[PDB]
Design a protein around this ligand. Structure first.
Ligand code: HEM
Ligand code: HEM
Ligand code: HEM
Ligand code: HEM
Lengths: 146, 141, 146, 141
């Protein structure tokens, strides 16, 4: 999106200390506990009964690695979000049938986690930049939804 | 939050509909799939083209479920308990889409029932449709 | 916004048969009735307690006449809705303080007014083309919000 | 609606807030005014700058009403009746902004309660806040 040169540097600075694989499994698992109606796609994941079962499922964790990976590689093309996600956008609509709202629920649970992860370092100005970034990433994924 | 003037309105305009409910419901979806493509995701096993029997068959159910709610407008949570469970643990439709249907419904009621679609009734229904959306999703978590 | 050849011809042909002073009066009244909290920005308009009042109130009808007017002006400039309302956007934000959300409510009440007036003519494809224009014009007004 | 567990977790996460309530409510506000500028349309009479006596004082009221909602979560409609009327008839805030203020309130609680903010607690706080959002807007029409 349109972030200033100071807001972009901020994003990158903080994401330089993010363990992409851990946050991935914490983001995707928390999305399935607070908003269970998302679980509708992961029947083939197994036990999703309790929050611990959901948070200790090797599949949910593994899928989180993917999501937040494709997410992290998109931080290098903040100036061309649609381009980079034009293909995953197409795929999520026609073959996955994933309601675009999900990328908004995930984008907010991603913010609450980075908040719980960095504490006082996750400052109000820093949060906004991230809010603009997640919205921008959600918007791009829902760009080719016919 | 439906005031007496509200139940009388809702019942009044829903009484005029009558037999046409099936036809009406069917159109509310077609307007929904065309005006809000993201609601097509919940139906990848359907044929969403104009004249689709599946869509007319679904509209029929949806409309009967509203007629059922208008009858038991005083005790909806129970008349709709079975539907609530179905949407909460099986279908798992995101709460947002309920707004798109309500909207698409009211539109279908205006382009069909103009004399009874006064700004008073208009406000009673929207509330009504809101009240049914509050029930059908009450058990999502 | 972007509309196909069939859509644009549907939106126009229809807008040619609209009394901009009747639809605008109606639309603004119902907004105030169906969504009462929007009555906040209009203390100096007089009587709004009953719907019979709201709809017969001359000041409310006078306004709706001007709003829906400035709306038709952008219907001429679809390819550039953002630059067409650049001045109004600023106005609504800075001096008026009107939560952009209120452009989203009016836009939906305006499609109900069109469906109430034209009946069958307002076929699903037509309405579809209209949900686009409104949401577009909505973003265009909210575009310069800080 | 809530569950016996959600209450215990709410009474938990909050019980730890203690005397940082009015201050945590103040941070949640700055955040909302930054990540969502559309909200500053309801405070054209405030001095919205870091440290403001108006923004702090307000954060104290907001939290205190929450401390009161938690004490009486077994009966929230009754306890927030005075605010329900205030928001419905005077302030008149669009029911959408309650969700934004809710997000900023969870971001704050998480950045301040590393030990407590677990997946199950996070889930409960999000419900509670929405449950508070529903009571304050219940009288809107
Ligand atoms: C920032 C957003 C997200 C990104 C970057 C993203 C990326 C991806 C990627 C890389 C794939 C693999 C595509 C392939 O098979 O070639 C995928 C698949 C998938 N995603 Fe997303 N995704 C996102 C959010 C989500 C969310 C929120 C949901 C839904 C509630 C979702 C559900 C799925 C599902 C069901 C699949 C297929 C599962 C599998 O085959 O393992 N995604 N996504
Ligand atoms: C006024 C609100 C709604 C009512 C009262 C309603 C009612 C119903 C009813 C009666 C059924 C049939 C259950 C059966 O098979 O026995 C059903 C199924 C279903 N509904 Fe809803 N529904 C509502 C909203 C939604 C929304 C917004 C969506 C769309 C995004 C949705 C998606 C579905 C799906 C996918 C099914 C199953 C379709 C099938 O039979 O294969 N519903 N609903
Ligand atoms: C499709 C959207 C809208 C358009 C195109 C539009 C257009 C306009 C225009 C042309 C002005 C007239 C300025 C003047 O000459 O005094 C105006 C003023 C104003 N608008 Fe809007 N507007 C829109 C939506 C709304 C909505 C939804 C609200 C609030 C619920 C709103 C509230 C007002 C008010 C109160 C004024 C200022 C009246 C005064 O103090 O003189 N407008 N608008
Ligand atoms: C969890 C939600 C909320 C709670 C618990 C809450 C609580 C309160 C409280 C306790 C008051 C003080 C009234 C008094 O002085 O007697 C109030 C006033 C106010 N609230 Fe709400 N509120 C909430 C959400 C909102 C939202 C989302 C907004 C708008 C974006 C908002 C805007 C206002 C404003 C403008 C005031 C008046 C400020 C003044 O004194 O001039 N409130 N609210």
């Amino acid at each position: 999106v349109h972030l200033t040169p100071e807001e972009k540097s901020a994003v990158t600075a903080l994401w330089g200390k993010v363990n992409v694989d851990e946050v991935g499994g914490e983001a995707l698992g928390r999305l399935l506990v607070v908003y269970p109606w998302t679980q509708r796609f992961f029947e083939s994941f197994g036990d999703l009964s309790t929050p611990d079962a959901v948070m200790g499922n090797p599949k949910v964790k593994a899928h989180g690695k993917k999501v937040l990976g494709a997410f992290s590689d998109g931080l290098a093309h903040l100036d061309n979000l649609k381009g980079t996600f034009a293909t995953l956008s197409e795929l999520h609509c026609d073959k996955l049938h994933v309601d675009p709202e999900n990328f908004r629920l995930l984008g907010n649970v991603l913010v609450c986690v980075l908040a719980h992860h960095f504490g006082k370092e996750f400052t109000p100005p820093v949060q906004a930049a991230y809010q603009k970034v997640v919205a921008g990433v959600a918007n791009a994924l829902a760009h080719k939804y016919h | 939050v439906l005031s007496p003037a509200d139940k009388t309105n809702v019942k009044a305009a829903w009484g005029k509909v009558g037999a046409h409910a099936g036809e009406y419901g069917a159109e509310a979806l077609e307007r929904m799939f065309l005006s809000f493509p993201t609601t097509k995701t919940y139906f990848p096993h359907f044929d969403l083209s104009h004249g689709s029997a599946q869509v007319k068959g679904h509209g029929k159910k949806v409309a009967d479920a509203l007629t059922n709610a208008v009858a038991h407008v005083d005790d909806m949570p129970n008349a709709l308990s079975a539907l609530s469970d179905l949407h909460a643990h099986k279908l798992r439709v995101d709460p947002v889409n309920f707004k798109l249907l309500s909207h698409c419904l009211l539109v279908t009621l205006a382009a069909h029932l103009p004399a009874e679609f006064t700004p008073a009734v208009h406000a009673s229904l929207d509330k009504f449709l809101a009240s049914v959306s509050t029930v059908l999703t009450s058990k999502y978590r």
